[PDB]
Design an enzyme around this catalytic site. Structure first.
Site, short mmCIF file in Angstrom:
data_model
loop_
_atom_site.label_atom_id
_atom_site.label_comp_id
_atom_site.label_asym_id
_atom_site.label_seq_id
_atom_site.Cartn_x
_atom_site.Cartn_y
_atom_site.Cartn_z
N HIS B 46 2.03 -0.68 1.96
CA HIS B 46 1.44 -0.81 3.29
C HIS B 46 0.07 -1.49 3.30
O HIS B 46 -0.60 -1.59 2.28
CB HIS B 46 1.23 0.56 3.93
N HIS B 48 -3.61 -1.09 4.63
CA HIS B 48 -4.50 -0.08 5.17
C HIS B 48 -5.67 -0.69 5.93
O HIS B 48 -6.05 -1.84 5.71
CB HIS B 48 -4.96 0.87 4.08
N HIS B 63 -3.42 3.68 7.22
CA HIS B 63 -2.69 2.44 7.44
C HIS B 63 -3.25 1.70 8.64
O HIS B 63 -3.64 2.31 9.62
CB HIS B 63 -1.20 2.72 7.70
N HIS B 71 3.92 6.27 12.24
CA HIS B 71 4.34 5.58 11.03
C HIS B 71 5.83 5.27 11.16
O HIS B 71 6.51 5.84 12.02
CB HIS B 71 4.06 6.43 9.79
N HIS B 80 3.56 1.30 12.25
CA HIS B 80 2.18 0.83 12.15
C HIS B 80 2.23 -0.66 11.84
O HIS B 80 3.14 -1.11 11.16
CB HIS B 80 1.47 1.51 10.99
N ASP B 83 2.69 -1.13 8.16
CA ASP B 83 3.82 -0.59 7.40
C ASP B 83 4.77 -1.67 6.91
O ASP B 83 5.61 -2.16 7.66
CB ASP B 83 4.60 0.43 8.24
N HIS B 120 1.96 2.27 -3.47
CA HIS B 120 1.96 3.71 -3.70
C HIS B 120 2.77 4.26 -4.85
O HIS B 120 3.63 3.59 -5.40
CB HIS B 120 2.42 4.44 -2.45
N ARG B 143 -2.17 6.14 -4.20
CA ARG B 143 -2.35 4.69 -4.20
C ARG B 143 -2.51 4.21 -5.63
O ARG B 143 -3.58 4.36 -6.21
CB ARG B 143 -3.59 4.34 -3.39
CU CU Z 1 -0.09 3.21 2.31
ZN ZN Z 2 1.99 3.62 8.18
#
Ligand code: CU
Ligand code: ZN
Ligand code: CU
Ligand code: ZN
Lengths: 153, 153
Positions: B46, B48, B63, B71, B80, B83, B120, B143
């Site tokens: 994602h 951020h 995010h 999300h 998002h 995403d 992630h 992360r």
């Molecule tokens: Cu993320």
């Molecule tokens: Zn998200």
């Protein structure tokens, strides 16, 4: 944005954090932070064009110069948008940065967001050197540390 | 910008280079490149909010989500802007990324330039996890690596 941050990393011991703050679009940007691991004296401080660090700092390109001007000091008229001048590092190799610039911005055409802040090996002569380099890089030498300028809160 | 790049680093063995290209301001962004050092499997991927790296990927914030939506996977209305789904690493731990997104942009309101791209530890439950938490992070674990997205030539 109104606040941006750059984390300077490099190959050597040179590392630091530089914050950028702009209260309102038209306003001057305050650049403040610390860099450690520098030889005492003056060091070029510029915003290079690309925020590409795939090949470290070399990939950052030349000075961000959208008005195709020549290189100079930050108070000079003819200067690259990214020519922020020199930062002085003390005896313990610490540069407590505090510049206030009105040409760079955190939004618009002259937005440095997404680009690379670079700290140099030698002093930037501000274009008063007398040779081709002077009006191109200011003869600041190699790039010790650099970092991509990102959006901070 | 039309092209941008992100060099993913972290405090672990994970790293890689992600590229983005956008032919026209209102078109979709081509996202591509690869990550290595990952465990075989799906991995949350994602964008951020902040491009703040003063504290590793922790300082990157939640995010990127300007429209304050929940999300979700990249193929949803309620998702998002940041995403980008999941990437999949083979038994070598290499993930070859080849996404095309229409929500994210390299310019304008939804500009991901200057923010942080993160990979992630856990696979993203694309929000359908039902976990109250799921609707925030999609339970993607920690992360592993991240990088501030920058403008490239
Ligand atoms: Cu993320
Ligand atoms: Zn998200
Ligand atoms: Cu420079
Ligand atoms: Zn210059």
């Amino acid at each position: 944005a109104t606040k941006a941050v750059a984390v300077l990393k490099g190959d050597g011991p040179v590392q630091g954090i530089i914050n950028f703050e702009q209260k309102e679009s038209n306003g001057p940007v305050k650049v403040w932070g610390s860099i450690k691991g520098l030889t005492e004296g003056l060091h070029g401080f510029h915003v290079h064009e690309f925020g590409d660090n795939t090949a470290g700092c070399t990939s950052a390109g030349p000075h961000f110069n959208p008005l195709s001007r020549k290189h100079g000091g930050p108070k000079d008229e003819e200067r690259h948008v990214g020519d922020l001048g020199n930062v002085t590092a003390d005896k313990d190799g610490v540069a407590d940065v505090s510049i206030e610039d009105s040409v760079i911005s955190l939004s618009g055409d002259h937005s440095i967001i997404g680009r690379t802040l670079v700290v140099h090996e030698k002093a930037d002569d501000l274009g008063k050197g007398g040779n081709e380099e002077s009006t191109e890089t200011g003869n600041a030498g190699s790039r010790l540390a650099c970092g991509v300028i990102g959006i901070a809160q």
